[PDB]
RNA sequence: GUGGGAGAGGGUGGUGGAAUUCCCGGAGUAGCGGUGAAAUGCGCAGAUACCGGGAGGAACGCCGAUGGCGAAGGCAGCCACCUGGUCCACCCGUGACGCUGAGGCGCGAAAGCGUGGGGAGCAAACCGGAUUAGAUACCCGGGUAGUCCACGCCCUAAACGAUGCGCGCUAGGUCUCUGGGUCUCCUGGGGGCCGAAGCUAACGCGUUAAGCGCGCCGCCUGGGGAGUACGGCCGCAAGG
């Protein structure tokens, strides 16, 4: 079904281009290091490619992970 | 006799034949049970009874050095993945807890013609 | 000249003697390529997603400078020496794209 | 890349009264800056061949304007060479 | 002209993580690998699976779309610089300066050619393995050119929307990327599906026209023989 509930739903207001706001962007990665579809993410054509963006920086400074390992299966 | 209460389960599978790894803490593999070392040779390790064997096999050559508590990970997809940790889970070993950790490619080697 | 914001990660087990003296260099090869710094934000140590270099922590520095165009690749070039300086990232300054509300 | 400081220079330089956004002579200046501007940026990156053609249409269009000088006042033309620097 | 915007449009330099192979160390045994089955191969000089370390080339998951950009070929990790196209708003400036476009010049996927560099993965040919009545194959294990880089040449293609460029005109509905607006609605550019009139041999097309029309270029005129022969032009050759 998808119908949880979009990250940006449950959010304030943001800067997309912040890219060292680690404490937000994690609501926008997967049980594993993946990035969110729109699906999930709640954002928009314009948005999710700024998102994008955004989240391959932090990767780059350490930040943000690029790929996790699973929990359970 | 060795004593190494607690370690690793490396669970690696695959479309022709299922092995396991019981590593210590630290990484360095104990005793390794594979599925043609069981008995069987060929079409028959992909079936998840070799892999059940294998898993079972695996442990009782770590209750022997006193294993006890284990965490379990797998590699890749193979035919009874499954079976394998099922297996652990009955063998007598405490199941901390499941890892997947498949190895996926950011796109590098160009694989080979079938895909 | 433009807008700049500069991404610099170094060992985070550097101790105070030895940490200002990196700072020293970052700054004077600042005033060495024209990058009248206008503010900087000193974050410190944060929990890296991953390990760089062998290490799980980094030291972590951020400068809005305001540099010559034609010399900004080379500015990097010059702070990516220091054996201990294991990150670096120059970004123009964007107008912040607000979201979600 | 061409800034608006240099760029309304060249309008002063050119227009024909005060005040004048949009004149031949303007118009064929202005490609002139971005053409030479494109030119010098085609001595390096020879593997551009894209921006090699929006100059061929720069150029085009340069000319375009010009032979519509040796139309109306020829005058106006015979000067804007020297203004500029063209031929070869 | 001024003020905005979007983009895998191109070029250069740089740099990030995954995986792969190899090398070293650690630990550890008897197999591993591969298939419909199998074998060829690799392992007691100790492979496989596992941890740590190092080298190197290629490529760039997710985001990623039935999406965007570009004239086409084609283009996706991140960053900076250099650079082309384009759209919207204001209606400011020139004053018809416009459209097309033989020959020409430039671009032009893949493979392929020269010299040099590079070589991880993959892989024509070639070497073996199995399959079969046979197998110069489809499957398995190797593997050289090549595939990556530079400079140069080659220039073809289901180089396809199989639909030349440019302008006007002729119901809408809906989805989507993108810009302006008084923004539950209006308004511009683009991508899709359905569909009026109309067209069409039919399929289909249908304001992204294959509709009603004007300009200009390109091309076709039974099949095979032939994209051959001859001749010329091009190219190092393959050839075109």
């Known amino acids: 079904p998808s119908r949880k509930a979009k990250v940006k739903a449950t959010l304030g207001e943001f800067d997309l281009r912040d890219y060292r706001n ?17 699906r999930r ?12 963006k955004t989240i391959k920086r932090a990767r780059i400074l350490g930040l943000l992970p690029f790929t996790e390992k699973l929990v359970r299966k | 006799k060795r004593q190494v209460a607690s370690g690793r389960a490396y669970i690696h599978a695959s ?32 079936t ?41 889970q009955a063998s007598g070993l405490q199941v901390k807890s499941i890892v997947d950790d498949t190895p996926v490619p950011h796109n590098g080697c160009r694989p080979k013609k079938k895909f | 000249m433009r807008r700049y914001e500069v991404n610099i990660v170094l060992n985070p087990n550097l101790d105070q003697s030895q940490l200002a003296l990196e700072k020293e260099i970052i700054q004077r090869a600042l005033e060495n390529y024209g ?22 922590q980094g030291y972590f520095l951020w400068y809005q400078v305001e540099m010559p165009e034609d010399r900004v690749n080379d500015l990097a070039r010059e702070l990516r020496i220091r054996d201990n300086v294991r990150r670096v990232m120059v ?3 964007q107008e912040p794209f607000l979201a979600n509300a | 890349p061409i ?4 760029k309304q220079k060249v309008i002063q330089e ?8 949009g004149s031949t002579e303007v118009q064929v200046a202005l490609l002139t800056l971005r053409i030479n501007r494109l030119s010098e940026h085609l001595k390096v990156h020879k593997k551009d061949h894209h921006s090699h053609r929006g100059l061929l249409m720069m150029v085009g269009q340069r000319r375009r304007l010009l032979r519509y000088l040796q139309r109306e006042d020829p005058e106006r033309y015979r000067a804007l060479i020297e203004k500029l620097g063209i031929r070869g």
């Open chain 3, 91 to 93: 970004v123009k300054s």
């Open chain 4, 3 to 6: 800034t608006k400081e240099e």
């Open chain 1, 22 to 38: 680690v404490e937000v962007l994690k609501r926008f990665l997967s049980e594993t290091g993946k990035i969110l579809p729109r």
């Open chain 3, 35 to 56: 990058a009248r710094v206008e503010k900087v934000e000193e974050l410190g140590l944060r929990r890296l997603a991953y390990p760089i270099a062998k290490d799980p």
């Open chain 2, 48 to 88: 998840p009874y070799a892999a059940q064997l294998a898993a079972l096999d695996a442990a009782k050559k770590a209750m022997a050095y006193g294993m006890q508590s284990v965490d379990v990970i797998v590699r890749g997809t193979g035919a009874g993945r499954e079976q394998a940790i099922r297996a652990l």
């Open chain 1, 41 to 52: 993410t709640g954002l928009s054509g314009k948005e999710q490619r700024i998102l994008a």
């Open chain 2, 15 to 46: 479309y022709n034949n299922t092995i396991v790894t019981i590593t210590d803490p630290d990484g360095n593999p104990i005793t390794w049970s594979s599925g043609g070392v069981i008995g069987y040779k060929g079409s028959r390790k992909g």
């Open chain 4, 14 to 21: 050119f227009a024909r009264f005060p005040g004048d956004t």
